[PDB]
Amino acid sequence: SKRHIGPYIIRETLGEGSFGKVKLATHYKTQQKVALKFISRQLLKKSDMHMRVEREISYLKLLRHPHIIKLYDVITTPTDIVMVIEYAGGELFDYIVEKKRMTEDEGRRFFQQIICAIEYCHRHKIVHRDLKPENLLLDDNLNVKIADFGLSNIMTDGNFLKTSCGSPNYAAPEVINGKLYAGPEVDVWSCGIVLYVMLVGRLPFDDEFIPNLFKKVNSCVYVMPDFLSPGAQSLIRRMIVADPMQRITIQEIRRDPWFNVNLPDYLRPMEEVQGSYADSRIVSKLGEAMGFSEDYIVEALRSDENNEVKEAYNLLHENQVIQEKLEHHH
């Protein structure tokens, strides 16, 4: 290229994603690192599908949660559409095994970040729900950043060929007898697994004597290390339940006493009003990113109910309130 793209001057290519290179760049005046994901317009056309992408991304344009990697912008060049993705150099599991076994105040800190992240999805019907070690990133403040941008282990390892369960590059489509892989209760199962791993250091379902030997997944998990508190066991026991239907939901996880201990304010539950979709501060913004038009937006927001717009309003509003609780606070 020209070495530049928008405010971002290229700096190094970190790995290769199917549709193009993933490059590291820094805002030209600010120095802010950022990850530039390249999508070839050529290759887009070739696959008889560009519409689902073009929109899947203008959609992401408006998710701004503290524990989900942000899409700051989409920049189209004559040859590529490049997604400007938030930068994060660490991987949660790497930290797990270095710390080996964490304290409860630590496991819980991380766990709250993850549970709140996927609740924000479930609530805005997003599918940013792939939760494998590669998707669980960490920034310099040890904050979890869930990443589902088909980035493999590029930002952590440089390894763009890492793949795991649930992906076509990993295994055949039929292996996953699940179109229900989009069930909210799958995210609770995975989250239960991560919690155990963070708190215990090893994985569950292990033969009790032989080290790292997978045994079986019983209907539920009875015995766990005694160093795990009763609050921690009870919660895990309620997440790693075989039958999806007997599994706890994130609504309940969020009312749980254990889970709530030390919950940072910007993460507290919000049982929102709603009303007045009459804020021009966000009305103007609903344009810039979602695209669309003012009056169209202004119109949509008089209706006597839920378009895709009387909720992208509420999404931008939720993002605002939790950005205020983050900074106008200690």
Curated annotation (Swiss-Prot):
Q: What positions does the entry give for ATP binding?
A: 14-22, 37
Tell me the impact of changing residue 163 to A: Impairs phosphorylation by ssp1 and nuclear localization
Domain spans labelled Protein kinase: 8-259
Question: Which is a GO BP term held by this UniProt record?
Answer: positive regulation of transcription by RNA polymerase II
Gene Ontology cellular component annotations, sorted alphabetically: cytoplasm; cytosol; mitotic spindle pole body; nucleotide-activated protein kinase complex; nucleus
Outline the segment boundaries, as ranges, of region: Auto-inhibitory domain (AID). Answer: 266-322
User: Which spans of this chain does the record mark as coiled coil?
Assistant: none
- Main EC class of this protein? transferase
The entry's comment on post-translational modification says: Phosphorylation at Thr-163 by ssp1 is required for nuclear entry in nutritionally stressed cells.
Localization per Swiss-Prot or TrEMBL: Cytoplasm; Nucleus
Q: Annotated Gene Ontology MF terms?
A: ATP binding; protein serine kinase activity; protein serine/threonine kinase activity
The active site is formed by 130
Q: What is this protein called?
A: SNF1-like protein kinase ssp2
The species this protein belongs to is Schizosaccharomyces pombe (strain 972 / ATCC 24843) (Fission yeast)
